[PDB]
Amino acid sequence: PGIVELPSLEDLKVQEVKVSSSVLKAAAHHYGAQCDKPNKEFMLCRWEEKDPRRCLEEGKLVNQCALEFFRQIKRHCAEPFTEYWTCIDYSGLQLFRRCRKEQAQFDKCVLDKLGWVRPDLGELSKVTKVKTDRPLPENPYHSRARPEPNPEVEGDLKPARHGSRLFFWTM
Template identity: 50%
Template sequence: MGAAHHYGTYCKTKNDAFMQCRIEGNDPRKCLQEGKESKGSCNEVFTEHWTCLDYNNQEHNRCRKTQKSFDSCMNEKLNLKRDS
């Protein structure tokens, strides 16, 4: 949920390729390359954000600081702005 705003825009093609590989091969281990390509450039701040959400029962108001860091990284490195 923490990356949903960005994930849908940036990772759709890569995620679709991973899911197609996984479905066709019935073995996700054969699709590791597609999965690695989906990680992106902001993994550290993304991990901080989803961890905050996880520990706070998905209460976004408690994780605005990590959300801001993640959104800034996505904007800076991938030129993706968060939709409201």
């Protein structure tokens, strides 16, 4: 067949969000609140193109907007966030429910210094709409032309010409 095209290693260099999973899980509700638009443009491009090579730049925007999400935490509320993700980080299942007062301190300092409202129960699971400028893929599966169907039956049904025509049976 053909050669599969791959992007170069410079096309894959972006500054990584090099924080732990409890750090990501601690700020995840405010992350889904504040980093909505580039994340949803990326996941729309990712379910529509069905190809990650066509989804690099939007992904870079994700990694552009996540870092600016954490810098904006690090400039303002580094200590209550640190006290919060440490308590998230203790738990083996990483329970939100074991960590409600540290969550309250982090949410208080974030609403005071950044004005961010934490999403409620049922908001980040909504199907939202995304206004992009990229065109709709007319053939995301790269499917070739389908075979033409067999001709259907038409014409009025006539009797059998002289019956069964089986050796001597005249009907």
